[PDB]
Amino acid sequence: MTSIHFVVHPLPGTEDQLNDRLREVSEKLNKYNLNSHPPLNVLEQATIKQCVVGPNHAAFLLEDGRVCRIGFSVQPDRLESPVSLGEDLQWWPDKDGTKFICIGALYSELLAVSSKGELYQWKWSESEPYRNAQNPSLHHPRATFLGLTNEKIVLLSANSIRATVATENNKVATWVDETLSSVASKLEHTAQTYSELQGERIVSLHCCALYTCAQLENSLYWWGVVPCFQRTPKKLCIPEKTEILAVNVDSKGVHAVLKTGNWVRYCIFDLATGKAEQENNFPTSSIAFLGQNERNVAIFTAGQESPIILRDGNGTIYPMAKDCMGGIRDPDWLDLPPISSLGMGVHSLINLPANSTIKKKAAVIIMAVEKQTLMQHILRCDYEACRQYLMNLEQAVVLEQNLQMLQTFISHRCDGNRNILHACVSVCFPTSNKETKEEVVESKDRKANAHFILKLLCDSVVLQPY
Incomplete structure (x- = not known):
């Protein structure tokens, strides 16, 4: 099970x-250790694949295929x-x-891609998504213009102003928010498979107000207005034999x-050179940093002007800061x-009132934090709770039940790749x-209990083999 936490940060900041x-x-x-609020408690037992913020609503995609949205x-x-x-x-x-x-987001509307490859439009002010009564498979009024009514979409990236998609047929397409329709005539393009992108599959998309980059199987390509039109995808100077x-x-x-x-x-890359x-x-x-599963690595970012969140090969937020040379400071751990x-x-x-110290912008960050129950008791110094958990995990071993729960706990990590005994210490x-x-x-x-917990953990027949 997981829990959902909300974080807010003024922009610019540090x-x-x-x-x-x-x-x-x-x-x-x-x-x-407070109880989670009812509205999102339904999602504690649910599996979340993707989470997004529109200008007044959050929205969530579940691995079971369901989608929902909520104003904030x-x-x-x-x-x-x-x-x-x-x-x-x-x-x-x-x-x-x-x-x-x-799923994805634009200033006027939520975006979604169905398993059928169909493009869906749902404005934040509307109670229902758009549907064409004359075409039951057309759920976006401009899908015809984009040619996407006959092309299965398989990847999407969209941030406020711009939206770019890859079709199963490797055709790129790109559209912009409705308020930009007067300039869209020079920014948008229909479903097209550029020769510069032929020869590799698009593995992911990275859209922004000025341009989009496509990440392909063995290379990077990008097009749009430079950070002035890169009219066709431009290859970047990737070093050879690198992953x-x-x-x-x-x-x-x-x-x-x-x-x-x-x-x-x-690495920071410059599109000019x-x-x-x-x-x-x-x-x-x-x-x-590479962790137990390298695929976990990411680089979540708020959009433009953004803070950054690296992630390690286990799912840690890696606690970056610059040093005063402009290199990287040692990891100021966060215990998460x-x-x-x-x-x-x-x-x-x-x-805000116009006198404010908080600026005209902030990031909103939504975190599907995982529930490591026994790790939390160790960190909370709840000696009795730790003892009870070990007694229940002892019964689990004797009864040959919930053995995966034990292995899962032993495999738990928090940030800095610390296992339980590093947490105790x-x-x-x-x-x-x-x-x-x-x-x-x-x-x-706190110290007394922590030492008793350390001793208890070192003594428990639950932990002895590990």
Whole structure:
């Protein structure tokens, strides 16, 4: 099971401010252990594939094919939880019984792609998605113009202003928000398979207001207005025999994570030279960043002007900050379970009084945080809860039941690739010389309980083989 948490951050801001938002959040999971609000409790047992923010609504795609959306409000308590939701959640008016494969967003409307490859339009102000009474498979009024009424869509990327798709037939197509229709005549293009993209499949798409990049099986290509029209896809100067782990875009250019044999480096690419304008090594081990499943690597970003969230091969938020040379600071750990999926979006704050210290913009971030129940008891120093869990896991071993639950717990990680015993040890750390001079859980009991927990874990027949 997972839990959904909401985070808000003014823009522009800083990486360590953001890390402190995550830190602030990370406290609550181990101090309050509060019950989740009803409106989204239905999603705790659900599996979430993708999460997104439109200008006034969140929306979620489930692995079971269902989609839903919900309007949101920022709490004045941090216009100064920072977020409050309505109790009315809207499930997709699926009168066809057709499941969805991915979703995306534009300023006027939600976007969705069905498993049939059909394109759906649903304006945020509408109670139902668009349907053509004269064409039951046409769920987007401009799909005819794009040729997409006869082309199965298989990938989408869309952020406020621009939307780009790949068809199963490798044809690219691109459209823009309705308010841009007066300039769209020079920005949009129908379903076309560019010769520069022939020879590789589009593996993912990275859209923004000015341009889109396509990530292909062994190369990167991009087109649109430069960060002035790159009219046809342009190849980037990718080094040979290298594997590309993830990619994303902003007004600054392209950001991507490159492997090279056992090495990993973080890279900013410039579309003018087509080469990397900066590379940095990480201060940690590279293998630690690659984790247990490399495919988990990502680079979530808010959009334009954005904060960044790297993710490791286990699902950790990697706690980046620049150093004062412009390299990478050591990882200022955050003590978090892995994030199964994460939504981001940019929100206007013109709703504020004009005197405000918080700026006219913030990011809204939506986190499907995973529930590591026994890891939380260790971190909470709840000695009795840890003991009870071990007693139940002991019964589980004797009864030969929920054995996968035990293996899953043993395989749990939080950030920095710390297993349970690293978590115990970190908890046992001293915090002041006043404590040694003198020599929610109180600090005195915190150390005592942590040491008793460490001893208990070292003693338990549950853990002995591990």
